[PDB]
Each structure stands twice: as structure tokens, then as C-alpha cells.
Design a protein around this ligand. Structure first.
Ligand SMILES: CC(=O)O[C@@H](C)c1cccc2c(-c3ccc(CS(N)(=O)=O)c(F)c3)c(C(=O)O)[nH]c12
Ligand SMILES: [Zn+2]
Ligand SMILES: [Zn+2]
Length: 233
């Protein structure tokens, strides 16, 4: 009831929340168990005329089915395309559910290769034009940007120009974060440089959404660089 952004202990595993970020922009929030602990994660929904563009799954098949049901209840427009912003399960787990619901699924070739090698679900379509740091391409109502290696080598960020919303995905941490999250596939040395590229490219961002946790403003970018430095040590 508070209308505040929902946190890990407020979402049972299997349920999905939506949160209105701006006109035609929502985040989606779900929770999942991994290695015996429970974590929240975010994705994005962007209105695309009378259709919706989805950014990232809800971290699992059941969660992603629940996401589609929540979208139908709260928005009532069809999801026609999805982009996964890197290869981990919190981004691609649920792609098979999307594909069986008629959603066209996309990711960079780097993400597709990494997902395949890991045994994770694989988006159908490859997004070219994103292989060099600083690259950007348009995809419906968003811009996709490859900042360089950070949380993962393939991580993409997403900008919604109509609303100045920057979806950082897992390359960006929330302000309360005290660690750099799951760093198994990260490049802690390159991460600050990749964040600097995001800061330079999107200086008018008004809302910044992390891959996990609460949205805020541009301060999330500098905070992320700071915590990555601290974790590395
Ligand atoms: C290899 C890989 O990453 O697998 C993915 C599916 C994965 C599994 C489990 C946890 C994470 C985290 C993670 C971990 C801790 C925190 C702080 S806390 N207070 O506990 O919530 C957080 F915000 C995010 C992340 C991420 O850093 O993006 N990714 C995760
Ligand atoms: Zn990840
Ligand atoms: Zn993540």
C-alpha cells in the first residue's frame, strides 16, 4: 500500500510487481532463490505505441509467466519484443516462456554466445552494432548502449529518451549497496571506466534504475564506481 518501491522481503518468490517510473515506463520487480539466498531483481517495460517492449526477464520461467500475467492485468497491451541485457539467469531465465507467448527475443551476439556456453536460455535474435564500447543503436522507443565490460563483459544499458530514464542493468548498483553484488563474471578493473562512459553519454538522465534494488538519480553511477573499488579490495 505504501506505493514505495518494493523490496526483497515484500515480494514472495513467484510474484511480480510493476512500478510506474514515468509516462509509458515501468520497472518490473521479482525475487528468486540462488545458492540458498533470496534476491530481488529489476527489469523494464516501455510502451511502444499499442505494444510493449520488455527489457529482461523476471529471473525464471515461473516468474516470467507471472510477469506476463501482471502486465496483462495492469497495462493490458501485448509484449511483442524483449531484449536481454546480459547472459545471466536474471536477464535470460524465462526467455523460453517469452518465446512460447509469441514474444520476439533479442540480445547481442556476445550475450547469446555466453548464454549458450553457460547453459542458460538463449534469445532468438542477434543485436548487431553493439560490439565496441561506446556503441549505441535504436530499438523501438529505447536506445541500447554498450559501455564496456563491467558486471559482465556483455552488459548493455538502456535509455528511454522520451522520459530520460537510464536503465543501467547489473552494471549499476543501488545507493544502499555495500558490495558489488555477484561478481563471478565481472571485470572490476574495467568497470569504473565503463561507468564513466555511461555518465558521459547520458548526462541528462533523471531516473537511474539498477539491475537489483531501488531506482534513484545519477548518483547511482558514481556510487557504483565507488563500491566496485571497495569490493575489489
Ligand atoms: C553469476 C550471476 O550474477 O548470477 C546472477 C543470476 C545472480 C545470482 C545471485 C545474486 C546476484 C546478484 C546480487 C547479489 C547480491 C546483491 C546484494 S543483496 N543485499 O543480497 O541483494 C545484489 F544486489 C545482487 C547479481 C548482480 O550483482 O547483478 N546477480 C546475481
Ligand atoms: Zn548478472
Ligand atoms: Zn544481476
Amino acid at each position: 500500500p505504501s506505493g514505495e518501491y518494493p523490496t526483497v522481503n515484500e515480494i514472495p518468490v513467484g510474484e511480480v510487481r510493476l512500478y510506474q517510473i514515468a509516462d509509458g515506463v515501468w520497472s518490473h520487480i521479482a525475487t528468486q532463490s540462488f545458492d540458498g539466498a533470496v534476491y530481488p531483481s529489476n527489469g523494464l517495460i516501455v510502451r511502444d505505441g499499442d505494444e510493449l517492449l520488455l527489457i529482461d526477464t523476471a529471473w525464471g520461467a515461473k516468474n516470467t509467466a507471472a510477469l506476463l500475467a501482471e502486465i496483462e492485468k495492469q497495462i493490458g497491451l501485448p509484449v511483442t519484443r524483449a531484449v536481454s541485457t546480459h547472459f545471466h539467469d536474471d536477464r535470460v531465465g524465462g526467455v523460453d516462456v517469452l518465446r512460447a507467448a509469441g514474444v520476439a527475443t533479442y540480445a547481442s551476439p556476445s550475450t547469446r554466445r555466453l548464454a549458450e556456453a553457460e547453459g542458460n536460455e538463449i534469445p532468438t535474435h542477434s543485436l548487431e552494432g553493439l560490439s565496441s564500447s561506446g556503441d549505441a543503436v535504436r530499438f523501438g522507443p529505447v536506445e541500447l548502449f554498450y559501455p564496456g565490460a563491467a558486471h559482465s563483459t556483455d552488459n548493455l544499458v538502456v535509455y528511454v529518451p522520451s522520459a530520460n530514464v537510464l536503465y543501467g542493468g547489473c552494471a549499476v548498483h543501488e545507493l544502499s549497496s555495500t558490495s558489488a553484488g555477484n561478481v563471478a563474471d565481472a571485470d572490476l578493473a574495467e568497470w569504473p571506466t565503463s561507468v564513466e562512459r555511461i555518465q558521459k553519454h547520458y548526462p541528462e538522465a533523471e531516473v537511474v534504475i539498477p539491475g537489483h534494488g531501488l531506482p534513484g538519480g545519477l548518483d547511482l553511477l558514481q556510487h557504483t564506481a565507488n563500491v566496485v573499488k571497495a569490493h575489489k579490495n
